[PDB]
Amino acid sequence: GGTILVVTGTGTGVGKTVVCAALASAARQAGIDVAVCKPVQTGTARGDDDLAEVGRLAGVTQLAGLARYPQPMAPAAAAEHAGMALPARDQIVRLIADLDRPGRLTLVEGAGGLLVELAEPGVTLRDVAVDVAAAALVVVTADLGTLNHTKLTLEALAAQQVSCAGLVIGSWPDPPGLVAASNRSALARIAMVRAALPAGAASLDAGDFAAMSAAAFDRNWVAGLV
Amino acid sequence: GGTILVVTGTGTGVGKTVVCAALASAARQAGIDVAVCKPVQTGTARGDDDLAEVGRLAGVTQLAGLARYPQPMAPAAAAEHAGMALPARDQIVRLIADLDRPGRLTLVEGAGGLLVELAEPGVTLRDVAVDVAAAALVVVTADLGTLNHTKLTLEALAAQQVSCAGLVIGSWPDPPGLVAASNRSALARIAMVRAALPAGAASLDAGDFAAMSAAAFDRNWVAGLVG
Ligand SMILES: Nc1ccn([C@H]2C[C@H](O)[C@@H](COP(=O)(O)OP(=O)(O)O)O2)c(=O)n1
Ligand SMILES: Nc1ccn([C@H]2C[C@H](O)[C@@H](COP(=O)(O)OP(=O)(O)O)O2)c(=O)n1
Ligand SMILES: [Mg+2]
């Protein structure tokens, strides 16, 4: 097998999808084959489609998913609203393992946070990471509260021996502001800050997004994910 | 001793201070002597003063602070900005142990989340709760993301054997939207939900706030918090 990473966030709207696209785009420019899997997608009625973002922004074509619910709620609530069940644990783990292959970087994007229910009954992206022996990239904010949330997610990961592959500041404000700059320094004291992605990068076209992504990550670290 | 409760939250601005005032008010109405302490206060140069607000809202007079920093940042960054030190771990425990007394409910409000650094090195409100053998009342939102934050916070508490006293939904909207309602039912399955304080409770006057506090909690739970 190759390399599998779960891309998780300290919360909702922290930039997980932009970070999947940014790391995919950088790995692709490093000559690395990339797949992104998003097992469960919500908010389809208003048009949320995270795989399509990665496709447009990064150019990934191996884009794999299992379920789509209309309501903009957490998976289990959106499923109950529609009157249908979440996918099974086995579907998710086997899908990801089939995507995985030597030389390929496989990114798994969950929904919202580390401990939200992804599959019936009560299986989370942490459970999925355990099952596929994946490491975890943690997307954080740079705003007030992020040190607590980061440390909480990092403890949850270690408790199930899910290795932390680093942090990414999903959105970096312009201009920074005194909270953000202080938090960037403090985040780097509790784990590796792999990138801070400029605010608004999701509006970029494919070429500008590729340029941004190539600069946003250290060259050696990406190539070494393998 | 009496009963010590640390009041912590899933994030900043979730209503820890309103909850302290509200639980204090309900305990006071039950005849229970209440003390509220705030070991680390930041933002004082914009008027941030949680003890003073608990006093305004619930009439609590036994209020105890220790560290105060001007800038509205995490305690560690607010100290650095002012050229001051964080308190030592034993200074926080002394502040709480001096208030602890039989028949008294002593509330300890944290500083913006359970693992925020309160003392050096990396000492948190969770360590303090271990030191004073307090349980933790966890204040949460009803908006999306609360289930993840709540479970991460509850796992962190169990990891150091700090008992969870239950959940308080800090701000409860009227009317409740679909997500709030779904989160509330799901939070109830994660731990006991002790209260869901109506949004905008900070604008109630002393009478209305105290009536809201009486209704907000189960009297049997309040009265059972301390003999
Ligand atoms: N560097 C960034 C990060 C997020 N954004 C935008 C993109 C979206 O509109 C919001 C939230 O980002 P995103 O959809 O990736 O958040 P989650 O996948 O839910 O974690 O912020 C951006 O434009 N530039
Ligand atoms: N049930 C509630 C909860 C919060 N508020 C107001 C009061 C404040 O202006 C903000 C934040 O609440 P609070 O100061 O207690 O938040 P934290 O102590 O930082 O957790 O919301 C309210 O009016 N009614
Ligand atoms: Mg407060």
Swiss-Prot record, chain A:
NCBIfam families: bioD. Its cofactor is Mg(2+). Signal peptide: none annotated. SUPFAM superfamilies: P-loop containing nucleoside triphosphate hydrolases. GO terms for biological process: biotin biosynthetic process. Belongs to the dethiobiotin synthetase family. While ADP, ATP, ITP, TTP and UTP can be crystallized in the enzyme in approximately the same place as CTP, it is their phosphate tails that anchor them to the enzyme, their nucleoside moieties do not bind in the same way CTP does. It catalyses: (7R,8S)-7,8-diammoniononanoate + CO2 + ATP = (4R,5S)-dethiobiotin + ADP + phosphate + 3 H(+). One of its GO terms (cellular component) is cytosol. It is found in: Cytoplasm. Binds 1 Mg(2+) per subunit. Homodimer. Keywords: ATP-binding, Biotin biosynthesis, Cytoplasm, Ligase, Magnesium, Metal-binding, Nucleotide-binding. Its EC number is 6.3.3.3. ATP binds at D50. Substrate binds at K38, P39, V40, Q41, T42, G145, T146, L147, N148. The active site is at K38. Mg(2+) binds at T17, D50, E109. The gene is bioD. Catalyzes a mechanistically unusual reaction, the ATP-dependent insertion of CO2 between the N7 and N8 nitrogen atoms of 7,8-diaminopelargonic acid (DAPA, also called 7,8-diammoniononanoate) to form a ureido ring. Can use a range of NTPs; has highest affinity for CTP (KD is measured as 17.2 uM or 0.160 uM in 2 different papers) while KD for ATP is 331 uM or 75 uM in the same papers. Gly-170 plays a role in NTP discrimination. CTP binds at T12, G13, V14, G15, K16, T17, V18, D50, G170, P198, A199, G200, A201, A202. Pathway: Cofactor biosynthesis; biotin biosynthesis; biotin from 7,8-diaminononanoate: step 1/2. This is Dethiobiotin synthetase BioD. Gene3D superfamilies: P-loop containing nucleotide triphosphate hydrolases. Inhibited by ADP. GO terms for molecular function: ATP binding; dethiobiotin synthase activity; magnesium ion binding.
